[PDB]
Amino acid sequence: SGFRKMAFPSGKVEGCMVQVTCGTTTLNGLWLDDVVYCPRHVICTSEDMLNPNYEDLLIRKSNHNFLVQAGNVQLRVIGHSMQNCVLKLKVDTANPKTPKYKFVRIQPGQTFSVLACYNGSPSGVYQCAMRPNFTIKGSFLNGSCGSVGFNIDYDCVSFCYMHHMELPTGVHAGTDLEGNFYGPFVDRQTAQAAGTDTTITVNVLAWLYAAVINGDRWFLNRFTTTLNDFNLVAMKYNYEPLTQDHVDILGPLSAQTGIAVLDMCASLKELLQNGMNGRTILGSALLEDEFTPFDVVRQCSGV
Amino acid sequence: SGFRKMAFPSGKVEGCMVQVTCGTTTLNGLWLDDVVYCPRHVICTSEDMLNPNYEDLLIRKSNHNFLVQAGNVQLRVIGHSMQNCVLKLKVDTANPKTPKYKFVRIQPGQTFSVLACYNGSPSGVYQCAMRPNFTIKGSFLNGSCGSVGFNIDYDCVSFCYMHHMELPTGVHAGTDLEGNFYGPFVDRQTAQAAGTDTTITVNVLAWLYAAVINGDRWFLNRFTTTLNDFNLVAMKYNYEPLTQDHVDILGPLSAQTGIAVLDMCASLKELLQNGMNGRTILGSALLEDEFTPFDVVRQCSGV
Numbered sequence: 001s002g003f004r005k006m007a008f009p010s011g012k013v014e015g016c017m018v019q020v021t022c023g024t025t026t027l028n029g030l031w032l033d034d035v036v037y038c039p040r041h042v043i044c045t046s047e048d049m050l051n052p053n054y055e056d057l058l059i060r061k062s063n064h065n066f067l068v069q070a071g072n073v074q075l076r077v078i079g080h081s082m083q084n085c086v087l088k089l090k091v092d093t094a095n096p097k098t099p100k101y102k103f104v105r106i107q108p109g110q111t112f113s114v115l116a117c118y119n120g121s122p123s124g125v126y127q128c129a130m131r132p133n134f135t136i137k138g139s140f141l142n143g144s145c146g147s148v149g150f151n152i153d154y155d156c157v158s159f160c161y162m163h164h165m166e167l168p169t170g171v172h173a174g175t176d177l178e179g180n181f182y183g184p185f186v187d188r189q190t191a192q193a194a195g196t197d198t199t200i201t202v203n204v205l206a207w208l209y210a211a212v213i214n215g216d217r218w219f220l221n222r223f224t225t226t227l228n229d230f231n232l233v234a235m236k237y238n239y240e241p242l243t244q245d246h247v248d249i250l251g252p253l254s255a256q257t258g259i260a261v262l263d264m265c266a267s268l269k270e271l272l273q274n275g276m277n278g279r280t281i282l283g284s285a286l287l288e289d290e291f292t293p294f295d296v297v298r299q300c301s302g303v
Numbered sequence: 304s305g306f307r308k309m310a311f312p313s314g315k316v317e318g319c320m321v322q323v324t325c326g327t328t329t330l331n332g333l334w335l336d337d338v339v340y341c342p343r344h345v346i347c348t349s350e351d352m353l354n355p356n357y358e359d360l361l362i363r364k365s366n367h368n369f370l371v372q373a374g375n376v377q378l379r380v381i382g383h384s385m386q387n388c389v390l391k392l393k394v395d396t397a398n399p400k401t402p403k404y405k406f407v408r409i410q411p412g413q414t415f416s417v418l419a420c421y422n423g424s425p426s427g428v429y430q431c432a433m434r435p436n437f438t439i440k441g442s443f444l445n446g447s448c449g450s451v452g453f454n455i456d457y458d459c460v461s462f463c464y465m466h467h468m469e470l471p472t473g474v475h476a477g478t479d480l481e482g483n484f485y486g487p488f489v490d491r492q493t494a495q496a497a498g499t500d501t502t503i504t505v506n507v508l509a510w511l512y513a514a515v516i517n518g519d520r521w522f523l524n525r526f527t528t529t530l531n532d533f534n535l536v537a538m539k540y541n542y543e544p545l546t547q548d549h550v551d552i553l554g555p556l557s558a559q560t561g562i563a564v565l566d567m568c569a570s571l572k573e574l575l576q577n578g579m580n581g582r583t584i585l586g587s588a589l590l591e592d593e594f595t596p597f598d599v600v601r602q603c604s605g606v
């Protein structure tokens with residue numbers, strides 16, 4: 001038993017992190033087979049980033065402007081191209097530690113693990129969720145660009161995020177491994193705001209099930225609610241609506257606890273309208289929305 | 304920016320996790336050089352764990368009763384011994400993935416990363432704190448024993464925890480890598496209760512320094528206090544007293560903010576006596592006590 005924010009073991013991704021240098025600027029790159037992937041704003045000077053014409057800057061570089069280091073071994077760049085906001089560097093040796101991998105684009109509300117790196121060296125790993133406004137509340141400092149997010153399915157790594165920038169509110173924005181940003185952001189050095197964020201309702205309910213599996217039940221009630229009447233209150237409180245697909249995905253947790261999904265919705269509806277009265281749920285003073293139903297089942301199956 | 308519970312990258316430890324089986328009982332082991340470390344109750348049947356005599360059970364075992372597997376690859380046991388509650392198995396292969404490492408016994412309040420493993424397979428990694436009552440609020444299921452806790456300085460892994468037990472209240476108990484339990488627990492399948500827990504004062508202080516560093520400093524006063532007076536008052540509120548070493552590890556944060564340790568103590572003492580008054584500190588209404596001064600330094604500086 002117990003419930004903790006848990007990330008996937010980072011070892012398979014650690015063996016792929018490298019350092020990429022162009023002139024004065026350095027960031028992290030992902031070395032899979034004989035290709036290194038990194039954010040394209042590595043080819044920018046401090047002045048270029050204000051309003052960069054990337055295709056211009058790229059055509060003015062050659063292979064020898066790129067210094068790639070794996071540990072203390074420099075890799076020779078023999079090719080380069082640009083796919084959206086991601087620069088791809090072909091090297092002359094394949095990574096012997098390349099795992100089975102795929103590039104995926106995740107949906108809002110889904111979670112992934114982030115391996116925060118600096119100068120190609122892993123610093124830490126933590127679990128994130130893609131917000132409905134397509135930001136992530138990560139922990140990134142200068143030089144963390146090129147850090148990747150991922151999930152692991154069996155022994156296959158699904159890369160879903162590469163970090164590019166921070167927003168004035170302190171949240172973070174990035175791309176998939178095809179170089180396409182999540183959300184309406186661009187890799188400029190300009191202040192950019194996201195849309196108003198909402199709470200991931202299906203995740204909150206999954207976390208309420210986790211709280212009950214671990215013995216916390218003070219918030220349960222005996223009101224009932226229809227799916228529509230719950231969604232009416234949810235949207236009023238800036239919560240994402242619950243789909244029937246969301247209801248079905250909560251099924252296993254409903255079966256384990258004997259609490260129908262709509263009864264858990266009634267409990268949550270009361271929490272939104274009443275508050276927590278200074279009480280806590282799994283040691284939290286706030287309703288937590290960065291655990292998916294999959295994340296809860298994986299941790300609580302077998303009570 | 305951003306503030307999160309962060310685990311160390313687990314790659315160095317993943318390469319040391321193996322599977323140890325005796326009869327039908329399988330748990331996890333730690334493979335460093337040519338020795339495998341695991342909980343000694345692997346030599347127990349389910350009925351044995353009620354009232355085990357461990358050397359009576361151990362002397363009835365020889366090297367060929369132990370199945371050690373790294374993946375599907377078996378490591379032949381060429382020697383065995385018992386050190387406290389940890390079984391050591393000498394194998395005929397030195398782990399080529401052995402990192403630079405160290406065995407340490409941590410103090411209450413110190414944090415570490417846990418690599419949760421099942422059948423020798425890492426499943427997740429999360430951050431933990433040793434509570435004052437010598438339990439950890441972790442997340443463990445059946446077959447998780449032998450999972451280890453660790454810190455990483457430079458490239459040196461400091462192993463500090465190996466998992467043994469779950470208590471009725473859902474918290475967990477284990478030993479250091481020399482087999483000595485943290486707290487007054489024993490590896491027997493009997494009812495054992497953890498003591499009443501307390502708040503880790505040095506970690507709350509570090510978190511107050513983190514708030515000040517980020518411009519959130521309404522809670523500072525002009526009062527000062529003695530170390531003795533603060534400790535006597537803090538125990539009245541279920542807070543741990545500060546040690547000599549606690550003051551010493553708050554030094555860097557004290558120097559960075561220019562706020563003396565005893566002045567921050569006087570600031571926390573008001574917060575305990577007067578409450579929080581519906582105000583916030585780093586976005587929270589709760590004081591956080593599972594971030595050490597090192598966790599704060601390393602996450603507002605990068606590593």
Ligand SMILES: *C(=N)[C@H](C[C@@H]1CCNC1=O)NC(=O)[C@H](CC(C)C)NC(=O)c1ccc(-c2cncc(Cl)c2)cc1
Nearest residue numbers: 041049140141142143144145164165166168187190191
């Ligand atoms: C990558 N190494 C780096 C990582 C971020 C820096 C600190 N935290 C991060 O997550 N990425 C960047 O520095 C990018 C580079 C662009 C995409 C070419 N820039 C920003 O993240 C950024 C842009 C603009 C502002 C800003 C501007 N005016 C006012 C304010 Cl309040 C903020 C901040 C950051």
